[PDB]
Amino acid sequence: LMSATYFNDNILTLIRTLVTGGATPELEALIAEENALRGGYSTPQTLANRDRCRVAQLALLDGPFADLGDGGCYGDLFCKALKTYNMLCFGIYRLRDAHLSTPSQCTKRYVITNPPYEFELVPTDLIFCLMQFDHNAG
Amino acid sequence: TQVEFYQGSVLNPHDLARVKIESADACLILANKYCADPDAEDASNIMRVISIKNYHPKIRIITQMLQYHNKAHLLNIPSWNWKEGDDAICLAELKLGFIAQSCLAQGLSTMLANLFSMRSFIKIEEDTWQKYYLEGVSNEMYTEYLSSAFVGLSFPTVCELCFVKLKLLMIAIEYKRILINPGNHLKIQEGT
Amino acid sequence: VKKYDSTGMFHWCAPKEIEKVILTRSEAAMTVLSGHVVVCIFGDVSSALIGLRNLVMPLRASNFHYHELKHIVFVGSIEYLKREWETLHNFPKVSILPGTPLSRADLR
Amino acid sequence: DVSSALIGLRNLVMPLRASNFHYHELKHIVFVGSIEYLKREWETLHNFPKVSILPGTPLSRADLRAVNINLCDMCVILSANQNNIDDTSLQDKECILASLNIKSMQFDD
Ligand SMILES: [Ca+2]
Ligand SMILES: [Mg+2]
Numbered sequence: 001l002m003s004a005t006y007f008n009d010n011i012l013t014l015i016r017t018l019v020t021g022g023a024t025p026e027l028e029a030l031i032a033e034e035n036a037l038r039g040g041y042s043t044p045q046t047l048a049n050r051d052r053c054r055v056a057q058l059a060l061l062d063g064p065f066a067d068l069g070d071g072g073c074y075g076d077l078f079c080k081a082l083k084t085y086n087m088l089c090f091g092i093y094r095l096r097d098a099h100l101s102t103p104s105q106c107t108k109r110y111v112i113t114n115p116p117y118e119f120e121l122v123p124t125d126l127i128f129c130l131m132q133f134d135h136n137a138g
Numbered sequence: 139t140q141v142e143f144y145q146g147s148v149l150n151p152h153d154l155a156r157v158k159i160e161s162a163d164a165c166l167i168l169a170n171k172y173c174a175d176p177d178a179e180d181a182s183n184i185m186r187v188i189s190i191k192n193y194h195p196k197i198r199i200i201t202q203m204l205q206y207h208n209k210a211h212l213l214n215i216p217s218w219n220w221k222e223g224d225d226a227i228c229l230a231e232l233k234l235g236f237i238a239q240s241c242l243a244q245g246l247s248t249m250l251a252n253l254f255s256m257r258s259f260i261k262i263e264e265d266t267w268q269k270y271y272l273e274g275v276s277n278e279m280y281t282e283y284l285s286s287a288f289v290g291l292s293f294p295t296v297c298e299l300c301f302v303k304l305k306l307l308m309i310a311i312e313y314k315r316i317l318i319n320p321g322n323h324l325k326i327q328e329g330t
Numbered sequence: 331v332k333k334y335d336s337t338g339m340f341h342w343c344a345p346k347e348i349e350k351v352i353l354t355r356s357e358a359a360m361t362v363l364s365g366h367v368v369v370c371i372f373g374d375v376s377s378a379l380i381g382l383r384n385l386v387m388p389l390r391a392s393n394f395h396y397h398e399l400k401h402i403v404f405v406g407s408i409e410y411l412k413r414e415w416e417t418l419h420n421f422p423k424v425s426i427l428p429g430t431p432l433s434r435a436d437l438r
Numbered sequence: 439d440v441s442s443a444l445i446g447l448r449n450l451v452m453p454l455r456a457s458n459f460h461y462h463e464l465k466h467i468v469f470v471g472s473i474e475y476l477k478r479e480w481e482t483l484h485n486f487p488k489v490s491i492l493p494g495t496p497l498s499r500a501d502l503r504a505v506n507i508n509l510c511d512m513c514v515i516l517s518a519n520q521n522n523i524d525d526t527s528l529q530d531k532e533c534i535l536a537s538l539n540i541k542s543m544q545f546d547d
Contacts, residue, residue: 001227002166004254005200008281009223011254014316019235019250020384021391022339025220030336032213035498037420039332039344046338052393053319057243078301082294088319090307091274093245096267110267111245112274113252114307128249130309130319138396149527176378181531188534206381211497214539234385241367241389241400 022052053130057093060125069125075117077127086132090114093126148186154193164223165190167201171229180208191217198223206231253279279309284330293320334392341390341399343422348415352426353403355435363401363425370431371406379414386421399423405431440474442518447479450514451486464488465511470496475518496536499543508545 004011016023031037060069060077068077074092081087092112097104099122109126112119146153159165167186173179180203187199195217203209203226218224236247252275259276262269288296293311300306310318314327332342353361369385386402401423404411408428418424429436451467466488469476473493483489494501496515507513515533523529 001232001254002168002200003256004279005225005227006164006166009225010281010316011279012225012227014310014318015232015250016235017316018318019232019239019388021388021393022337024337024339026336027340028213028220032210032499034500035210036417037342040336041331042333043338046334046336046392049337050334050339050392052339054391054393055239055243055246057245075301079298082298086294086322088297088309090309091249094270099265099267099270109245110271111249111252112270113249114274114277117301117305128243128246132321133393134395181528184535185527185531188538205379206384207379211535211539214497214499214535214542216538216542218542228384230381231384234380234382235388238385238388 018055047135050135051133053088054133056129056131057126058129060121060127061123066123069121069123071123072121073117074115074119074121077121078117081129088130089127091128092119092121093128094122095124098122098124149189151189151193154190159190159194159197162197164198164200167199169202169204169229171202171204173204176204177208180204184208184211187212187218188215191215196222200225200227202226203228204230253277284311284326286328288326288330289328291326292322293324293326294322296326339392340387341392341396342420345420346422348412348419351422351424354427355429358425358427363403366401366403368437369402369404371404371410372431373406373410375409375413377410382414382418386424401425403427405429405436439472439519440478441522442475443521444479445516445518447483451489466490468492468505468510470494470501470505496532497539499539502540502543507540507543513540 001012001015013023058065060066065077065081068080074089078087078089081089090113092115093109094112095106095109097106098109144153144157146156148154167183167190169183170179183201183203187201190197190199199218200223201212203212206228209226209228209231212218212224212226236250239250240247256278257275260272262272284296288299291299293308297308300308310316311320311324311326311330313320313324314329317324331344334340335342367389369382371380382404389400389402402421403425405427407430408426411426411428415426427436431437447469454465454467467486468490470492472495473491476491476493480491492501492505496502515536517530517532519531520529523531
């Protein structure tokens with residue numbers, strides 16, 4: 001982190017806002033002032049800045065990604081997802097034995113970061129996704 | 139030609155003056171993450187920070203903190219300013235955040251860790267999992283002010299243009315602040 | 331009653347009693363826990379603290395749907411849990427189970 | 439802490455009670471610290487008036503706001519860990535940390 005923290009000072013706060021979930025400096029000031037988190041009454045203003053992109057994983061076995069995942073390339077699926085669902089694929093969570101011809105019972109998967117456009121895709125692959133949010137799902 | 143060494147204590151102002159800290163771009167402090175007593179190492183780093191801030195308060199400090207409660211002590215230093223770039227990388231806090239992000243989506247901790255690590259471009263003759271893994275890992279996260287030709291478009295449009303033409307993948311931008319994967323409604327501007 | 335932070339991008343709830351959320355062997359037996367997160371703490375009276383707040387903080391980010399939240403259960407020796415509980419009594423959906431994570435019955 | 443040594447705080451408050459000063463010029467006394475050490479030394483401090491005890495840590499900003507540090511006549515900092523800490527530069531742990539904490543404090547009027 002040090003080198004990455006040195007050559008770009010905003011890397012640490014980017015990590016804190018992408019990993020901890022938006023650690024704003026107001027919250028840090030409150031924590032430093034109180035040394036703990038206390039209760040408080042609700043404010044309607046806390047419902048407009050919560051629209052961001054969540055990080056998760058999605059499966060290509062089923063759904064609308066299956067047709068492009070049955071022997072297709074990574075680039076086509078990435079472009080279609082970006083065009084349609086405001087998607088952003090930055091890696092593939094691919095089963096270790098998925099590329100092997102012999103079908104095994106293994107489940108654990110590894111990560112391939114930023115595959116090329118012409119990268120061959122396997123239908124049983126998982127991809128990393130950044131999505132939107134809706135405030136009326138509760 | 140890139141590294142020089144000098145013997146001295148951080149708590150000694152003369153040693154800090156010897157290395158010309160007043161003209162140094164930044165000061166980096168490393169911690170022993172495997173100490174028997176984490177509190178003692180955290181305290182020693184705290185007084186290293188205290189001494190360097192006492193000599194030059196405007197110097198940038200990037201330091202490791204083993205515990206969050208000891209990290210909160212640094213926020214009480216008058217010279218400790220987050221805006222200037224005083225970065226207390228909390229190993230416990232960041233590791234727990236990475237674990238929680240893995241809980242949200244398995245395998246994301248290694249994806250994040252490999253981004254911060256500078257890795258070369260290595261190829262393996264035989265078709266194994268390590269070949270594809272090393273192909274993936276060779277990608278690091280960089281930052282750059284974008285061109286003026288892109289101005290007037292949307293972020294997904296620039297993402298597609300960079301991936302198809304320039305073979306570049308964008309994850310976040312700045313809007314005229316860091317915005318991670320902004321929606322299609324946001325528009326890129328000059329100096330992005 | 332504080333469900334969102336000052337900025338409004340986090341989840342939280344009112345403080346709860348120590349025994350209000352602690353589940354014993356039987357209490358875990360009837361209470362079915364599915365789609366949750368298990369955390370196995372090892373330690374003793376002389377062990378050092380960890381700072382588990384940042385372990386649960388990003389799970390409560392408000393850019394996720396509320397129905398997508400996950401229950402949190404911790405398993406460990408009650409001495410260490412009662413040692414660190416002073417910093418974990420303000421969070422909801424947090425269960426404490428005394429014992430050892432090496433026991434199969436506890437994990438069942 | 440529990441293993442820390444005593445101080446003998448009687449002489450800290452004794453001259454404040456000298457009778458050559460007017461009674462209305464007396465000053466309230468508040469102590470802030472971890473309740474274990476306070477209950478350890480309280481056997482020699484239960485006979486004095488205007489003596490408040492606050493459990494917690496002086497490094498906490500909320501405790502100092504509760505004490506109203508900005509309104510106090512004077513603040514003093516003492517550490518009983520000055521003996522158990524072997525390294526000489528580290529025996530001034532909490533004194534220096536709390537001094538810089540109060541100096542960096544921001545108050546609203
Ligand atoms: Ca590289
Ligand atoms: Mg040279």
